Amino acid sequence: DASDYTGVSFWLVTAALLASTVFFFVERDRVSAKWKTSLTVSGLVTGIAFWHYMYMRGVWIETGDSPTVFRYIDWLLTVPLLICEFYLILAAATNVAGSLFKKLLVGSLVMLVFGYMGEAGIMAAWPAFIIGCLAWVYMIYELWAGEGKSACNTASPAVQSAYNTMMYIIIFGWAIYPVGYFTGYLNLNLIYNLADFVNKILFGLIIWNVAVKESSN
Amino acid sequence: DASDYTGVSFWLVTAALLASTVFFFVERDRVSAKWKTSLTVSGLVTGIAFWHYMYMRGVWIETGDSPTVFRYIDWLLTVPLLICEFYLILAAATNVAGSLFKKLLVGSLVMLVFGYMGEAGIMAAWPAFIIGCLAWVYMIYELWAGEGKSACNTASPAVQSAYNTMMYIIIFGWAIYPVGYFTGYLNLNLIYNLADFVNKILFGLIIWNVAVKESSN
Amino acid sequence: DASDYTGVSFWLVTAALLASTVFFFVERDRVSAKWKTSLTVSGLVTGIAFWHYMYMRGVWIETGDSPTVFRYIDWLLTVPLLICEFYLILAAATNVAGSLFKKLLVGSLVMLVFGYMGEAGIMAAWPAFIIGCLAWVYMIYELWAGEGKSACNTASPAVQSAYNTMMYIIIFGWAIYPVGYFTGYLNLNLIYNLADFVNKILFGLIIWNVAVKESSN
Amino acid sequence: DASDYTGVSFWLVTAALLASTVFFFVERDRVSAKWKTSLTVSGLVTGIAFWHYMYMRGVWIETGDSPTVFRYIDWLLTVPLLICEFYLILAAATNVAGSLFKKLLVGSLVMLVFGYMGEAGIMAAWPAFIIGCLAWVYMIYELWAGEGKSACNTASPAVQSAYNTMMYIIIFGWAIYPVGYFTGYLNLNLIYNLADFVNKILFGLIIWNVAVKESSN
Amino acid sequence: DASDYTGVSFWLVTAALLASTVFFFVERDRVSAKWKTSLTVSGLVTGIAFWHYMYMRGVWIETGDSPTVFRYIDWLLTVPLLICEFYLILAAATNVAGSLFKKLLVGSLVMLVFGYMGEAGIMAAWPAFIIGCLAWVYMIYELWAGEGKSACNTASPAVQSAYNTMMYIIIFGWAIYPVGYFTGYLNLNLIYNLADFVNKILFGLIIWNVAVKESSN
Numbered sequence A, B, C, D, E: 001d002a003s004d005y006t007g008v009s010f011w012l013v014t015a016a017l018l019a020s021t022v023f024f025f026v027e028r029d030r031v032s033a034k035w036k037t038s039l040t041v042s043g044l045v046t047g048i049a050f051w052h053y054m055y056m057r058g059v060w061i062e063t064g065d066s067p068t069v070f071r072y073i074d075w076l077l078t079v080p081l082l083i084c085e086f087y088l089i090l091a092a093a094t095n096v097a098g099s100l101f102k103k104l105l106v107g108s109l110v111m112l113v114f115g116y117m118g119e120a121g122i123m124a125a126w127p128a129f130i131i132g133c134l135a136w137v138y139m140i141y142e143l144w145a146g147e148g149k150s151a152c153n154t155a156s157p158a159v160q161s162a163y164n165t166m167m168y169i170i171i172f173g174w175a176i177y178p179v180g181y182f183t184g185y186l187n188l189n190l191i192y193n194l195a196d197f198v199n200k201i202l203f204g205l206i207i208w209n210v211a212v213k214e215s216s217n
């Protein structure tokens, strides 16, 4: 109906994710060979999100609850790719080690795992939330003042601007998710749909813009 | 049947939209790298329209009413892309700022939002209609005598002709939609199907023609 | 079963149309950029035909009648593209005006519209049939002794041979359809399936052969 | 179950055919423009076979019999393409007339038509079988000591080896099908599934190997 | 639910396999023509695995058992391709005979066939397990100290590193499967899902990394 404001968002986000997947997979022609992997991973993130959103909508229609397990599965598939996009754009613009890829991957996995262990009641909410936030802040530090920044200082100003915009998304766009978690252990589906919009489409658009600019110039 | 003249139009428009989506995604080979983004966005518009038309047909078969929410969702996804096609073709032919992209996007969003707020009864029909028409006229001015025209004067005559044809579509092809709104607050589905034909397929065909001409010459 | 000889033809034609669509969309690699649009339109015709044949088969399974409206929808989408293939191949081989594109399009539309107005009983069978035949003969004249021939005389002999073969298809392959109409107003589904084979697959194969020859040589 | 040994083969062959279709359509990048048509036709054969095998499996699940009509439809679509692959590989390696294409096509069609006329009881089993075998042997002669061999003697040794391997498949791999026919008019579904494996996947693999070798060297 | 830990793994692995298939088919642009076949085969393995995992999930939903036949069908299609990836990467980096391709294929087929003959009770568990392990060790020897190693010593150090990593996967990643077999004849579905992750996605990622490095450098 026109009063829930949740199914409307579900449909809007699902169609936008499909559109973004097609856009990312098609626009690899405008970028050089180095940036094609970044655009491919961006498109993979949007496609996996669309894939899981279809089943989440199906479960919403059948039962009418929140599929926490399905959202965490989508996260366990997409958050590592989104965090490794930093390594990808740094590799397509300068010499990045790959140690960064490893540590970012590990941090994201830890963050998700402990978050789920708090969601499922396996571990007490406070401890799991604190550990997940520590993993989040560790990824933030690696992208802000750690190895990621050291690789960022040897890149082109366009790549640096894209890196900073993506970092701001990781700090403020991502902060939506733990906040809801906090609220759950002391609207959410709508908030997560809009947040996935911001964190799945705008992220890839920033990557696409910088890749196209670098290839053209 | 052969008397409604509405389901026939639904099927015709849906098949035409699918055909147009395939055509736009396939014909990116004849255009240069700069015009590929324009053709991609055109194809995305047609694909989203087809996607939502399938579900609108499903709802028509099940219940048999007009899905206003679904049409406005399709609009909220396609109208911004269609209006940003102006920025796209100006970027693939001259130096356009991107401020135009921003302002056009904002105007289209305002137009749609206020239109829906009048459709759902949230805001009185008159005020919302006036605000939406002001947003429409603001987009018209930006494409006619504003920043869009300033970027248009530094383009090739073929690009200028495509720009003027698209502007005439924005003025007269788009005027179909508010008129129906006016009539609703004082056939429509058939009119909107034919209008989507005009405003979703002919628009992309104009873009494709100018892109192919520019790439070939 | 093995006695109707109609469902067998339905399946054969549907699979052949899908195969032809894939072939046309894939074989655009062997042709130059100019001929890619012709191959794309050919593939679009076969794809739309396949698309509508699936639903015609569904209606045949459910009810078991002849969907005149569905066939005329398929025609209203495919006949204009097939007739504009002449303009396409003339544009990819010499200087054709585009006035030809306009007049051919108009003639095909008139032919289909009046034919349907005779099929639905809106207009008397004789007058509508005569007007449709006049439109058919006008297209024949434009392709035989009119503007189309003038553009044909300035083309390569391979393109001229393809043009003449396509013209013979337009004269004799297309004459199947009005004949049935005549018989209806004084087997048909099987005849139309085989005719669609001839007029949808062989036509595109002639176009593909000439395009490949021109690109290779 | 694990005792029929027929549904297992159905699933294995169907998945292999889909895999082969994707492989053939994807691997056109490693071949020159001349060999792309051969790879496309190979992929079309596998795709049509997969398409019809899906419906054959559906009919097997519903009723549980042998769809002779469906197999002969698949043959009427695939056998001409498989036999014309000889003309294709000869055209992409030397000067072949195209008369070969015509005569091979005619022979294959005659073989299939008379075979079906014997299967459906229209014509006596003996006469139809003899005529079909004569058509088969005529195709064998045209590929062994006729026009096909004359075109083969002017090709590269790799193309000659591929031609001979394909000829051995036409002689011994194809002989599976009439033998079953003989047995039927005096296990079969399993035999035909494995034979389609041999005659639909190995054939295309031989073609792909020779095309890749010719393009690389 | 959140307690089985098996359906979660099923969904995770299925989505990851689809993502990997798309990634492998898309990333063929960054590799040279020689490595395209390796990436294609990798993508085929992931696609076949996804294809069969969908039906395995369907059978799990309907009945709720372990489809041994379906897993062995997936193996009979994917294990030969995975083992022939060694020949592929050796061919795209040095002169490998193809005798290796033959012997590896034969060994994998023997391993699978005898394994199934032990699973279905056709042959006693001990003898079939011993023969399958002998085939496994024969493949290990051919990749470690046999013809595969001789071809490996004439390759680039990056290709040698990829070869050694793949060999370690064949030794330790693959050892998961017979161990379960042993346990079955004296959790498993979860173990096989995670093992397919390791042996279907990481394998292709190693291949993709080495191919991209070789093409770039």
Ligand SMILES: *C/C=C(C)/C=C/C=C(C)/C=C/C1=C(C)CCCC1(C)C
Residues within 6 Å of the ligand: A074, A075, A078, A079, A082, A111, A112, A114, A115, A116, A128, A129, A132, A133, A136, A174, A177, A178, A181, A196, A199, A200
């Ligand atoms: C596309 C989906 C994305 C990008 C999801 C991101 C989710 C997070 C960044 C979640 C973070 C969490 C914490 C920092 C606290 C622990 C629980 C969380 C998982 C929600």
Ligand SMILES: *C/C=C(C)/C=C/C=C(C)/C=C/C1=C(C)CCCC1(C)C
Residues within 6 Å of the ligand: B074, B075, B078, B079, B082, B111, B112, B114, B115, B116, B128, B129, B132, B133, B136, B174, B177, B178, B181, B196, B199, B200
């Ligand atoms: C593909 C769909 C398109 C291009 C829809 C366009 C819709 C409009 C331009 C609607 C305009 C309206 C006004 C100017 C008045 C307010 C209400 C409206 C939204 C129908």
Ligand SMILES: *C/C=C(C)/C=C/C=C(C)/C=C/C1=C(C)CCCC1(C)C
Residues within 6 Å of the ligand: C074, C075, C078, C079, C082, C111, C112, C114, C115, C116, C128, C129, C132, C133, C136, C174, C177, C178, C181, C196, C199, C200
């Ligand atoms: C793919 C479908 C095609 C090419 C259909 C073509 C149909 C015609 C050329 C029909 C012609 C007719 C007349 C000339 C008389 C009026 C009625 C007709 C429409 C069947």
Ligand SMILES: *C/C=C(C)/C=C/C=C(C)/C=C/C1=C(C)CCCC1(C)C
Residues within 6 Å of the ligand: D074, D075, D078, D079, D082, D111, D112, D114, D115, D116, D128, D129, D132, D133, D136, D174, D177, D178, D181, D196, D199, D200
């Ligand atoms: C993919 C399917 C293929 C290649 C089928 C081939 C079938 C034949 C070569 C059948 C031959 C027959 C005869 C020679 C005798 C007449 C009856 C037949 C049709 C089975």
Ligand SMILES: *C/C=C(C)/C=C/C=C(C)/C=C/C1=C(C)CCCC1(C)C
Residues within 6 Å of the ligand: E074, E075, E078, E079, E082, E111, E112, E114, E115, E116, E128, E129, E132, E133, E136, E174, E177, E178, E181, E196, E199, E200
């Ligand atoms: C993608 C699936 C893969 C790579 C499956 C691999 C399976 C094996 C390597 C199985 C090996 C076995 C033995 C060595 C003992 C005999 C029984 C087995 C088949 C499970």
